[PDB]
Design a protein around this ligand. Sequence first.
Ligand code: ADV
Ligand code: CL
Ligand code: MG
Ligand code: MG
Ligand code: MG
Lengths: 205, 202
Amino acid sequence: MLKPDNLPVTFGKNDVEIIARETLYRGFFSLDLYRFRHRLFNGQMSHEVRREIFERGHAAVLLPFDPVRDEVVLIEQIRIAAYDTSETPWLLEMVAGMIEEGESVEDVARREAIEEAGLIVKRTKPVLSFLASPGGTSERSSIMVGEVDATTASLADENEDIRVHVVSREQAYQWVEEGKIDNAASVIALQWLQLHHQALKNEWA
Amino acid sequence: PVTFGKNDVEIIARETLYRGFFSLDLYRFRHRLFNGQMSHEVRREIFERGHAAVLLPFDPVRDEVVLIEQIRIAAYDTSETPWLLEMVAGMIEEGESVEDVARREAIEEAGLIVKRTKPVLSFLASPGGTSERSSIMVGEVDATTASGIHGLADENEDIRVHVVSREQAYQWVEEGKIDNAASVIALQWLQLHHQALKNEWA
Ligand SMILES: Nc1ncnc2c1ncn2[C@@H]1O[C@H](COP(=O)(O)CP(=O)(O)OC[C@H]2O[C@H](O)[C@H](O)[C@@H]2O)[C@@H](O)[C@H]1O
Ligand SMILES: [Cl-]
Ligand SMILES: [Mg+2]
Ligand SMILES: [Mg+2]
Ligand SMILES: [Mg+2]
């Protein structure tokens, strides 16, 4: 038979038992309660543990990058939840969209690039996929870098709710360091780009 | 860059839809459009769970990182395993500073006594559906003493500590073996600033 998969952690998916899932509140996004038992590091089985989980979904995130002009296209839009801990709820972000049945991360990213920023992506490349806050939410965001021509930017579909900004990669990175760009998807994407722009520029050359 | 501020948004109401360990709130508001007019009323369901203090344990002398392992059941449906490799992290309670929480949780979750500490970055995990803000700090630790299982008994935290070189942790992030936001952000930051940090502390 097959050998088991290698894991970087101690226990795998088979070492936990999801006893039950109950909806605590059902709205656009449901807040659920998971009842489960899992192996402890000391070898013993746990009691039943209960956790409230915000079932948010799965998102596609696209970093529009122009390797020739070394620029990034950012979108400005309001994220009301940022109101209580930010100076302004209008954030500079990446192209993004929720992924539904039968859709791929790439399909959503390309479609969002057109709807939100009026950009037509060329080559795309998988970057990273992260869990926004796994202690309380199931959300998972997959990031891809999209090859674009920043000339075609700076009139898009959602132009009254979304404003497009074309800036140098270095300017964008600087804003992250200064804390002027602080939403997870953007920070991760821009740090990744700052760590890999040369190779990506040569790859797409 | 951004020009619209809080005066460009009219929060009509914030209602509590659900209140348990965490709360679920509804925001009813109007916000200005990029054509200058005000939007119709908009509703958004927001997950309110407080704010977090995150600590990246870094040994400048050995160039190693201390990671903690623990199960996060919310990762079950989209991950290969619910047990994640993460940074020390705690919920900031009533009037506690990011530093107090980060240093306290480091003892609690990993039994590490952090020496010098430095702020890193503060981010919003997902401004679209949650108000959560996580503030990351890097803490100087002696990795040769980091070990074993920890976590608070009364909270029922079962946490195991792992010590790996900084390069490995960074490669695991680019490889998707560490993929929770706080850890990814903290480790890419470390990879971008490790030489300057070693120079300062080592
Ligand atoms: N889903 C939940 N429902 C009910 N009780 C819960 C839930 N999550 C955690 N708790 C309770 O809080 C303790 C964790 O305390 P912190 O240690 O004080 C906090 P920590 O878990 O670490 O969260 C900090 C950051 O790490 C994760 O990524 C989170 O998303 C967050 O951004 C757990 O032992 C448990 O008792
Ligand atoms: Cl498997
Ligand atoms: Mg914790
Ligand atoms: Mg705590
Ligand atoms: Mg804790």
